[PDB]
Every structure is written in structure tokens, then in C-alpha cells.
Design a protein around this ligand. Structure first.
Ligand SMILES: [Mg+2]
Ligand SMILES: [Mg+2]
Ligand SMILES: [Mg+2]
Ligand SMILES: [Mg+2]
Ligand SMILES: [Mg+2]
Ligand SMILES: [Mg+2]
Ligand SMILES: [Mg+2]
Ligand SMILES: [Mg+2]
Ligand SMILES: [Mg+2]
Ligand SMILES: [Mg+2]
Ligand SMILES: [Mg+2]
Ligand SMILES: [Mg+2]
Ligand SMILES: [Mg+2]
Lengths: 138, 99, 164, 258, 167
RNA sequence: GAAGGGCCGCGAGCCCCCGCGCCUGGAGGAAGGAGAAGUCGUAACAAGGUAUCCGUAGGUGAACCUGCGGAUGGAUCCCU
RNA sequence: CCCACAGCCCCCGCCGCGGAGCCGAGGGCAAGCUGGUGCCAGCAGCCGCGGUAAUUCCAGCUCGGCGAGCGUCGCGCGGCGCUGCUGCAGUUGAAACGCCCGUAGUUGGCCCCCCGCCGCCACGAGGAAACGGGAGCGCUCCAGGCAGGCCCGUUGGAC
RNA sequence: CAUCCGGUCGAUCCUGCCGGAGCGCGACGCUCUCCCCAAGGACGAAGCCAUGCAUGCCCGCUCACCGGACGCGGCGGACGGCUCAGGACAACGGUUGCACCCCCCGCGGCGGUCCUAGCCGGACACCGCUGGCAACCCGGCGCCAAGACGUGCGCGCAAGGGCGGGCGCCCGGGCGAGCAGCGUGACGCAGCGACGGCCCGCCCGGGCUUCCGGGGCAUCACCCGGUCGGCGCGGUCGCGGCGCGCCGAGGGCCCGACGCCUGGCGGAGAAUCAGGGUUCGACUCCGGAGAGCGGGCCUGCGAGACGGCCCGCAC
């Protein structure tokens, strides 16, 4: 009918699928190569960087920081979620930055933020916000 | 030549059709087969080009059917020699002919 | 390389695709209560075993009765099931296998045979006794609560001859 | 590409029929060149340690062999890795044990105890006739043996009887329809049967059709068909008459044995 | 060094392949012998250690060889005077370089010493009463260290005479 | 038969030129997106106050206007 | 007892440390009581909460899930009949080239009773094991391993 | 072992996406009673290296010292182990062939050698005296040993070469296949031999070779010019444009050439789960390639080897 169905027509089917499977946004983003080069994390679970400045229908200002990745030298912003953790981060402190739940895209009402802060001076943020450990060495 | 020369026929014997005959004592033979793709449960038609040495004892034109026998390397791309050839007519719609 | 690299290994249990489902939670708790089960990995092991049995039975059932593979595999499966006691002796058709349930698996546990012999006051009492090593399966003492007892040894599970 | 020959052999890469444990170790014995090839032989140490159990380790086998406590075709051998093949003669006078190495139905090596009447000869297969130096005819066998000046009546594929003490042909059995054979290659190793038909395809293999004593029929190529007499075996063979049972019977026998 | 491995060539379609390993010792060659006719200096033959311990001897200078007359079944050792025809190139002839297929001139003394007194091919007699005979080289100098051959006769002799007559 | 020399063969390194691929500075120019509660008017949604839209050409602070031909997804399934 | 020596498992006598955390309680999604703050601080994978009872933030009590494991981040499979051979859609949602001719390519009505050739189906040979499936064996069970018992198929390691 | 749920509206049905729910691979945070099995510097740095170790053994040769030293000689060091840089009709996987090949140990045979043989000749090592230089390294003189080196007694024997079959085809040494061997006319004295093995067959291994499979981009559509064939020689273990001389022109392509890219070793396999399939495949076994980059070579049956040497470059 619309599609080919002859007994000697596998080549055309393979070619058609090869051509048409590039139309999916997800497949493109995963197999095209542009995102991997444009992603400052280069496919890594999380990165180690250096902070350099603190900044911050809902009308609540969210606290974040500007960071520069050691291995990449490009600039990004990562947002420190847990309450009272602004004071736990000081200018020019080594940090480890991961991603939000949605890879690539922004999450929530925060404009222009796509990362998270999970470690400072080598201590997990969660372990410090609950007072399990302490940052007396810095 | 396999009959009046000093070469021997050994290995595989195959069949094909003549594709070109511009060379001095050589031709190009076309072979047809089928390939099966499991995902789509269908076949594809493929072809290959095979060079052979043609002794002066045969008269061959395009579209004829030839039988080739394997021999030792006779050149960079040649390992076959013709031993038989059936004739064909000039007017004959080309037909996919596995052999 | 080291010889330790050739030692095989695999898991033995599965987790439900939908975790939060009230009827399943209640049924699993009820089965734990009637069998005094520790955690929920044992039920998963039981379901794994049952699935293997059912899949084998299905594959054998699709084939013809006079298929040599069918005869061989069905005979082996029936012999194993009967020797374990999970399937009744009077049944020897592969069709009956599909109707088996995990409860029949539970009934052949060491605690089960211990209790139905009236040797213990309860499943919990049976487990605690098993831990302390007061039981001689066959002629050998066993401290594994989940040890399964075959038919030929059910009459031979006794109290340890060394226990106080 | 290795710059030279291979001197090792991983255990996992060893032939299946040697029956070597996976956890025994990384390495396995490497047979040395001799009467038989790698895939058509078995080392001495395996027979003397993993079967007869007269030794528990490599060292004990070394001492036993270097003391000259084993004879092969009438000749003492001191190499633990010496290859033992088919229709060979195994003698240990210390315990008066005489064996001829044959194949079982399942396709593995076995020892057939024998007598003193027939341990002075062995049967070999002839598969090459050629002209040597000066044009003098020769022949070769499956055990790497050469004999000069054979009888013209002897042709290829035949079978030859030769004394152990002297490599002098006594009698030869022809290759012909209606003769008992023993298969020695592939899926049908160890089966005994009589020939029924011979079909040849030019330039390729030759296929042989045989019928077992109980009527079973099977096929194989001519490269692994061995003659063992005229309508009756010339030598003593294992207890079973080359009958491969089905899976049902083997399972029944295992159940009986258990 | 010199080699005859095919990795450095092109494909039937004229494409570059790409090199995936360094040079190997099976695929090696050697500088040609360039055997010279003599016309310190003397018969000089060297030896080459080849694969598997074998020995290959190539000749650098020589002057004598064994030649045959097939029709009359006569065979002796003679001196080669010079080379006079070679299909491959004229440069070899001017330099008097010995290779298989070269047409040479031998001296007639060993043959005339017993010929000119028996009925035989007329042309061979005419050469015999002269000072040289046309012959050919059949061996492979550079591989066996010798230069043997046979005397021409028949259509090929006519071919070579017609070829070298105008010169 | 050593050192040493000459011609060829293998072939490094440097120099000169050409081409291919990936990054990247830049006065000025121009696009898009987001943010705010900015200024100028009202183009569309009702016959939206000149029915809307398409192609082409020109003009105009801006939305847009006009001419030629077409469609109804129109505001008409209806008249010798 | 074992071990090249030592450990370790296990057996034997004496004295005998009983210890659970990680997430969450509006829906998806099983699981609710007071005090604070007031579109601030914060939560939130999505919808959303917080501008005075905040069933969603911060604490206490209570409760639920899994469990010596629990949660977070990135990737692949599945979810997905949202890549569709099985098995998508194409008037109006995204999508039938303005129309005709036409080569490669794909597809081609019916009929001959037994011959040859191609495909096709079944069987067979031949060719590595491990992994995988699988027969048998109670390492105390098991993850495993190919053992092991006495009067063992030639004990077995089939396929 | 064939499952779905929430979100566009004043309410409703659809398309369509967003998010949730499971498994595996890793990294991070918290926590941790006992036993068994068990991976472990691979993730566009094939980046750089102190320190220590990873190949020795012994059958022959003792006037060495009181036979053990040492050294000559023989065998082995080309196996094993590490890694995946390079490389996309290649490698690799299955299937053929050498009637175009080489092959140590081992096994079985065979063994006739042209023109002082109660046993030939001279050396070196270690070692003694004498010495150079920071180190590394070696020098000069001196008697002495061989299953070492050299010559060599002896029944003719290596390599190569010329001549030796047929009358339409087919119907023994061996073949499917005029292939091996032999005779004979001439060249040449190779190998074995001062305690006898040159030689042949088999085996393992290697080299190449037939057929089929063998990544992506057409904002790469025409490409190749020893590239395609023929004749002749050279060289090679050996066939072959493998190299050279001459002649002719040819070969490949929408059944996708050529070009470019690849954070590209391949396979046996792994993860996932109705059935059909998708993604991965550093790493256990097989095969290939390399030892800072690029080249060259000796010894040896076997290496273009690097725990072998020589050169240039960067350290
Ligand atoms: Mg208006
Ligand atoms: Mg209007
Ligand atoms: Mg309108
Ligand atoms: Mg519209
Ligand atoms: Mg539309
Ligand atoms: Mg002599
Ligand atoms: Mg000597
Ligand atoms: Mg790479
Ligand atoms: Mg490997
Ligand atoms: Mg290498
Ligand atoms: Mg090197
Ligand atoms: Mg090194
Ligand atoms: Mg090395």
C-alpha cells in the first residue's frame, strides 16, 4: 500500500529507516555530537570547579554561584539548593557540581540555571546541612 | 591457456555472464546472488565483478554465459580462467541470473 | 589472569514492576505471618523458581506428546518435583504443573515439616530452635531455616542427638 | 603474529574429550610432536595420573617415567607429554597390565585390557604412497611410520598388520564394501559397523555409508574410517559392540547406577 | 629495506589503503647481481644466506658454460665471446650483461674439432667453419651461479639472424 | 683483510611552497530570546467597523496600504 | 585440623557485648498533631505550596517503604504501536511533489502432471572451549563445583 | 514474566509532548553485626619515571683452590606477560588451495662419496706478570683443554641445464587433472666424516590465496594514471606491477565509487525483556598491532626483536 512490501526490498526499508530516524529530537541530541561538544560537562557525571562570585508568579530569589570548570575554562552558574548553604560557600572555594533531574534543560522556576552544588572543600552538602560533619578546616 | 599452456585448474568452478571484453586476453564476469536480511524477512539483489583470462581458443561477446575455473595468481586481480562458454543473442532483455 | 575470574555467579530473585500496590502488600504480609518470613526477598526467590517451572512446562507443552525432547525434559521435571514433594505423587501430567503456587513451595520448608510434625510450638519457635542447632535432618544437623526437605527425609527429620 | 611456534596451551582451550577440570588451573600439558597430532592423541601423564591414579602430581609421573616403568609399542618412553593415539600398545610389566588404546562410543579414549597372544602386533592405516630417493617406493601410516619396498597389491586407505618387534608387514586388509570398520572422526567416533556404499565427488571428499549391527545407519568422510578385519574384528574390543544408545537409555542407566 | 609486500600499492579502484604494520622480513628483496661477461679479474661467485639456512649463489663474473646441439646430440664446454641480442633492452647488450634469454656468441673450436666431417644441418656447419656460433642462455644467473644453454636451430635462428643482420 | 674513498638502494631530519580539518581576536553592522508596570498608534478575533487569506510588484514612522490574478478556511449550499 | 610458614573455614573444653539506618507522609505514590515564619526564608523530577489553619518550608509526636542497606547524578534498555517488518500517520491536528513523459529500481493475469537449473523446506557431514540451555550428584542450604560411594554402566562428567 | 498514571479547558473528546513508575553500568552522601564468592588507574594523558625485582640451566672441557670456583661449549631467551596508539573492500569470522611455498625439537626410516686413520695442526678463554682511566671500559707478554675451529682417510654424488609420449576425446608410483621418478649427452665437486650424519616422511607453526559477511556523512558524484591488462627479465621460500624495459589501452561508480570523520581493535559474547528487536562489546578464550616518534640491521630453523644493536628527533 503506502509502504514497500515486496520480497526483495530490504535495502529500501533499511535506507528509509536510517534517513527518517534522525527526525527525533532525543535521537538527534544523543547521537548527533553537537550537544556533547556544547555541554560544558562533556558527558561527565559531575565536575570539579572553582567558584568566583555569589549571586541569587513566585517572587522568591534563588541563591546560586558563578563557577569556572578547571578542565574546560568556560563559565556557568550552579544553584545551591539547601537552606542556609549560602554561608557555607565562600568565594574562591573548590566545589563539585552536578546536574538537575532534567539533563540539559532548566528545572523549576529558576531562569538560566542547570546545575547543583553537592560538595565544598570535599564535604557533602547534605552531610553538613544536617550537622553530621563540619567545615572547620576552611 | 589451460589446454596448451602450463597452468592447472583447481578449486571452485563457477558460472557468470560477460560484462566487458575490451582487454587483450581478458574479460570481466558479473556474478549474481542473493542476500537475506532477517529483520525485514526479505532479500536483496547484489552483484560482483570478477576478472578472468580468456584464451584465444574462445570467441565471446557481451552477455554470454561462461564457466571459470580457479588457478594460481595470473596477475594483480586475476585468479580464474575460462573453460566453457555458451552463446547468446544480442537482443535479450537483461535478466537477473544467479548461477 | 587469576583462576578466580572463571567462577560463575547470578542473582536469584526479582522485584515487582509496580511496587506500591495495596493488595500485593497485604497478601505478602499475610504470607509472612502464616510462614513467619523475615524479609520479602524470600517471596521473590519463590516467585523466581515458580516462573522457571512454569516456563519450562509451557515450552514442553507447546511440543507434541511424542517429541523425544518433550519426553526427556518432562520426565526429568516430574521426577524432580515428585522427589521434592511439591507435586503430588498421583499427578504425572505436565498440565498440572501450571497450577502450582508458591504456597506448595513453602509447605516443604524445614520449618514447615518441623511444625506439621508437632515438633515445635510455632513457626517463630521453630526458627529459634533451628538457629540453636537442636535438629538433625536425616542424620545431619542443619541450621538453615530455608532448607528444603525431600520426601525420603521427611520421616527422618529429628531432634539433634547432641542437644541438651 | 607470534614470531615462533607455540609452547603453551591454556586449559580452557584444551580438547573437550580430554575431560580436564575447569578449576584445575590456567595451564594444561602441551603434547610434543611424535606419532600422533595434537587433536588425535592424548598425553601420557593424563592416562597415568587422572585415570589409573598411580600418580598424584607431575613429579611422581616424572620419576615413574624416568625410571623406565612404561613401554610404548615395545619401547620405553620417558616424556610425560609423549602423545598416545589410536590402536597403540600400553604395557606395565610391574603390574602385568596390558592395554590397547581404542575409542569409546561417547567419543573419548579408553584402555582395553588384552592378552599376550595379540600384543606383538598393531593395526595401522595407510594413507600415502610415494616415490622417495632413487625412486624407491615407500608408504606412511597414521602413527608416523615409513616402510620401504611394499607389495604392489597394497593400495591407499588399506590397513596393515605389523609386528611390534619388527616393522614387517604380516597381512593387509583391503578397503572394500562388506567389511567391518571403526569410525574415528567427528560426531560418530567409536561406532562400529559394516560398509554398504561408496560415493565419490570429483575434487572433493568421499562419503561412506555404513550400517550398525542393530541396523542403524550413518555416514562420514573417508578420512576417518578405519578397517579392523574382515567381517569380524581382528582384535579384542570394549564390552559394548560399538552401539551408541539414545539419551533415554543413558538416563535410565544413570538412574540404575545411582 | 627493499620489499615486495602489497600494502604499499593501490586498490583495483585506484585508492590508497593505509599502513597498519611496520615492515616484515618475509617480504624482502635484494639488489640485482648484474652478471658481467669477462671478455684480480676472473670468475667470481658469491653466496647468500637465504631463509631456512638455505644457500643461494649468484655470479658476478664468468666466461664459460655448457652448451648443447640437440639435433646432433653434441654437448661441450665453450667460451662466450659477447652478447649480441636481448629483447628487454639494448643497454644490457652494450654492457655485456648476462641474463636468461640473452643470445650470445660462442667459440667454434670445441665443436669444429669434431664437426665438418658428418652430414648435419647446413647452417650449423657454416657457423662451425667460422669463428663463432649463435646460441642462447637457458639458466638463471644470479640464482644458481651458472650460465648454460643450447644452440639455436630452426625458425628462431632465422628470426634472430633477420633481426641482427642490418647492424 | 682493517681504516678510508666513489656510484647506486633504504631512508631520518631541516628548509620552501600548496592544500585539508578544528579553534579563535576584531572597530562597526545586523538577528533572535528573556526580563519590566516604558513611548507611538490600533493591524487581527463580531460584516472587528475598508470581509479574511495566497502569489507577485511598488510605496510607507510602525503595525500596514495599494494594483493584477486566485481561494472560501465567507457574511451566500435557494430564482427567465 | 589445614597451611611451603602463617593465617581463615570447621571440630573440641573454659569465660560469655544482642547493636538499623536511609528516604518520605497533597496527587502520581503506600503513609496525619501542635509551635514558628509570613510571595521572606524555602520546597518542588510535573501539577503546584508559601501574600496568617502553610494537609507541601522550618521543629516535636505519629505513621509508611526497603532493609545492612538506603538515597542522589550521568549513560543504555524498557515505558514507546513517540521510528511502527510484525506495527504509526498524511481532508480539517505536522505531513500527497502544479501536471505529464521517462531510465535505473521494485512489481508483474491465466495455462503444459513428471526433464535440467536458482531460490525454498527437511536431514546429514565438518568444524574449539568457556558463557547459555540442560541429565545426574544434599559443597549443612545457596551463590557454586564436577563430584562421589561402595558390592560403582568400563562409576560419571550425556546432549 | 503481552500492565500503565498526572499536566493545555468554564466543562468534554482527541492529537501531541512533558514528568513518574523498573533493570543494569559507574561516580557522590549516609550507615554498617557474622560468614562465603569476588572486580580493582580503560573512560579523546600509547603522558612522565626514582627505588627494588621480573631467564637461566647443564649432560662435554679440571695440573684452578682442596672435586665446588671461573671461563670455552650446548640449549633457551622469537614462549610467557602489558596495552588497544595505529588502521575502515584492511583487520577479523566462516569456507577453499599451494599441481606457486618454508619449517627447530620430537617420532619412524634411510645410511654405498671421484681424484699420520692405534687418532692430525694452531689458537683463544679463565689464569700469572706488567698497566692505563673519575666512571664506563679495555691493552701488552706468557705455557695450557675441547662433542670448539681448520684440514681430512672414504663403494660417485648436491643444485641447475639439453634430449626422451600421443594423431577427434574418453575407457600404473599417484592424480579429478602429463604430475613425480628414471635413462642419457655435458657442466660443477656442494653436504657427512679424529667418538658418522647429509637425506626423506609425519607433526606443530608460519606465509600467502578462492567464496560470503565486514561504521557513518551526498551541504563528498564522478575517481584511479603502475592506476588496468599483455610480453620479457630481475628478485623472492615462493605466485604475483613486487621492481624495471616495451606495447596497448583499460579498470571502478546511485546494488553509493572516491573523499572526509570516528572520544573506531575484531569475534566468541554482555545489558535489556511477551514475540519481533535496541544499545554496548578496554578487560577472562582465539586472532591482530605496538613497546617515546620515524627508520635500519646482525645472530639464528624462526625476529625487520627493542628486559638485542645503529642513526636522526624530543626528553
Ligand atoms: Mg481594526
Ligand atoms: Mg478588518
Ligand atoms: Mg475576516
Ligand atoms: Mg491551519
Ligand atoms: Mg495540516
Ligand atoms: Mg673424494
Ligand atoms: Mg670436526
Ligand atoms: Mg583509536
Ligand atoms: Mg589477547
Ligand atoms: Mg613486536
Ligand atoms: Mg625494534
Ligand atoms: Mg621495557
Ligand atoms: Mg621482549
Amino acid at each position: 500500500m503506502s509502504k514497500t512490501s515486496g520480497l526483495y526490498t530490504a535495502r529500501k526499508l533499511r535506507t528509509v529507516r536510517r534517513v527518517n530516524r534522525w527526525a527525533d529530537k532525543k535521537y538527534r541530541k544523543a547521537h548527533l555530537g553537537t550537544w556533547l561538544k556544547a555541554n560544558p560537562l562533556e558527558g561527565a557525571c559531575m565536575a570539579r570547579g572553582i567558584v568566583t562570585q555569589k549571586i541569587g508568579p513566585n517572587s522568591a530569589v534563588r541563591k546560586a554561584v558563578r563557577v569556572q570548570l578547571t578542565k574546560n575554562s568556560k563559565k556557568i552558574t550552579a544553584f545551591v539548593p539547601r537552606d542556609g548553604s549560602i554561608t557555607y560557600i565562600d568565594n574562591n572555594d573548590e566545589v563539585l557540581v552536578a546536574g538537575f533531574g532534567r539533563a540539559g534543560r532548566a528545572v523549576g522556576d529558576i531562569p538560566g540555571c542547570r546545575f547543583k552544588v553537592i560538595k565544598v572543600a570535599g564535604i557533602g552538602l547534605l552531610a553538613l546541612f544536617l550537622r553530621k560533619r563540619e567545615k572547620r578546616a576552611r | 591457456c589451460p589446454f596448451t599452456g602450463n597452468v592447472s585448474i583447481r578449486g571452485r568452478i563457477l558460472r557468470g555472464v560477460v560484462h566487458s571484453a575490451k582487454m587483450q586476453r581478458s574479460i570481466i564476469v558479473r556474478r549474481d546472488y542473493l542476500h537475506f536480511v532477517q529483520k525485514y524477512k526479505r532479500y536483496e539483489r547484489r552483484h560482483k565483478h570478477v576478472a578472468a583470462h580468456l584464451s584465444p581458443c574462445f570467441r565471446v561477446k557481451e552477455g554470454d554465459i561462461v564457466t571459470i575455473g580457479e588457478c594460481r595468481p595470473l596477475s594483480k586481480t586475476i585468479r580464474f580462467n575460462v573453460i566453457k562458454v555458451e552463446p547468446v543473442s544480442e537482443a535479450a532483455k537483461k535478466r537477473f541470473s544467479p548461477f | 589472569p587469576r583462576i578466580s575470574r572463571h567462577r560463575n555467579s547470578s542473582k536469584t530473585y526479582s522485584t515487582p514492576k509496580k511496587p506500591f500496590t495495596k493488595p500485593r502488600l497485604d497478601a505478602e504480609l499475610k504470607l509472612c505471618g502464616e510462614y513467619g518470613l523475615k524479609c520479602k526477598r524470600e517471596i521473590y526467590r519463590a516467585r523466581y523458581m515458580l516462573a522457571k517451572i512454569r516456563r519450562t512446562a509451557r515450552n514442553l507443552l507447546t511440543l507434541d506428546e511424542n517429541d523425544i525432547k518433550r519426553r526427556f525434559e518432562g520426565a526429568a521435571l516430574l521426577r524432580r518435583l515428585h522427589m521434592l514433594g511439591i507435586l503430588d505423587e498421583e499427578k504425572d501430567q505436565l498440565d498440572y504443573v501450571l497450577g502450582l503456587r508458591i504456597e506448595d513451595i513453602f509447605k516443604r520448608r524445614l520449618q514447615s515439616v518441623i511444625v506439621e510434625s508437632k515438633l515445635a510450638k510455632s513457626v517463630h519457635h521453630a526458627r529459634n530452635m533451628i538457629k540453636a542447632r537442636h535438629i538433625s535432618v536425616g542424620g545431619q544437623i542443619v541450621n538453615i531455616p530455608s532448607y528444603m526437605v525431600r520426601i525420603s527425609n521427611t520421616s527422618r527429620v529429628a531432634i539433634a542427638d547432641t542437644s541438651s | 603474529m607470534a614470531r615462533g611456534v607455540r609452547k603453551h596451551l591454556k586449559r580452557l582451550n584444551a580438547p573437550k574429550h580430554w575431560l580436564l577440570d575447569k578449576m584445575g588451573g590456567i595451564w594444561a600439558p602441551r603434547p610434543t610432536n611424535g606419532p600422533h597430532g595434537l587433536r588425535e592423541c592424548i598425553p601420557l601423564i593424563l592416562i597415568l595420573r587422572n585415570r589409573l591414579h598411580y600418580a598424584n602430581t607431575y613429579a611422581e609421573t616424572s620419576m615413574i617415567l624416568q625410571d623406565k616403568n612404561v613401554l610404548i609399542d615395545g619401547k620405553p618412553r620417558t616424556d610425560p607429554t609423549f602423545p598416545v593415539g589410536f590402536m597403540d600398545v600400553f604395557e606395565i610389566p610391574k603390574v602385568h597390565k596390558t592395554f590397547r588404546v581404542l575409542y569409546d562410543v561417547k567419543g573419548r579414549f579408553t584402555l582395553v585390557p588384552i592378552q599376550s597372544n595379540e600384543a606383538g602386533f598393531k593395526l595401522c592405516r595407510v594413507q600415502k604412497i610415494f616415490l622417495g630417493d632413487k625412486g624407491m617406493p615407500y608408504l606412511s601410516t597414521h602413527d608416523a611410520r615409513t616402510i620401504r619396498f611394499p607389495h604392489p597389491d597394497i593400495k591407499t586407505n588399506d590397513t596393515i598388520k605389523i609386528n611390534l618387534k619388527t616393522g614387517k608387514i604380516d597381512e593387509w586388509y583391503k578397503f572394500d564394501i562388506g567389511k567391518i570398520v571403526m569410525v574415528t572422526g567427528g560426531r560418530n567416533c567409536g561406532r562400529i559397523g559394516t560398509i554398504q556404499a561408496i560415493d565419490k565427488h570429483m575434487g572433493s571428499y568421499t562419503m561412506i555409508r555404513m550400517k550398525d549391527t542393530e541396523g542403524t545407519e550413518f555416514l562420514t568422510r573417508l578420512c576417518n574410517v578405519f578397517v579392523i578385519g574382515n567381517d569380524s574384528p581382528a582384535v579384542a574390543i570394549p564390552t559394548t559392540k560399538g552401539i551408541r544408545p539414545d539419551i533415554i537409555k543413558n538416563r535410565e542407566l544413570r538412574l540404575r547406577s545411582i | 629495506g627493499i620489499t615486495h609486500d602489497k600494502m604499499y600499492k593501490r586498490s583495483k579502484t585506484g585508492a590508497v589503503q593505509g599502513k597498519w604494520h611496520k615492515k616484515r622480513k618475509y617480504n624482502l628483496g635484494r639488489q640485482p647481481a648484474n652478471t658481467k661477461l669477462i671478455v684480480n679479474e676472473g670468475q667470481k661467485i658469491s653466496t647468500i644466506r637465504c631463509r631456512g639456512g638455505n644457500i643461494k649463489r649468484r655470479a658476478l663474473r664468468l666466461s664459460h658454460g655448457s652448451f648443447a646441439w640437440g639435433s646432433a646430440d653434441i654437448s661441450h664446454k665453450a667460451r662466450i665471446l659477447q652478447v649480441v641480442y636481448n629483447s628487454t633492452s639494448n643497454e644490457l647488450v652494450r654492457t655485456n650483461t648476462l641474463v636468461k634469454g640473452c643470445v650470445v656468441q660462442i667459440d667454434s673450436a670445441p665443436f669444429k674439432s669434431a664437426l665438418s666431417n658428418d652430414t648435419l644441418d647446413k647452417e650449423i656447419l657454416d657457423q662451425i667453419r667460422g669463428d663463432h656460433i649463435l646460441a642462447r642462455i637457458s639458466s638463471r644467473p644470479g640464482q644458481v651461479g651458472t650460465a648454460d644453454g643450447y644452440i639455436l636451430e630452426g625458425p628462431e635462428l632465422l628470426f634472430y639472424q633477420k633481426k641482427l643482420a642490418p647492424k
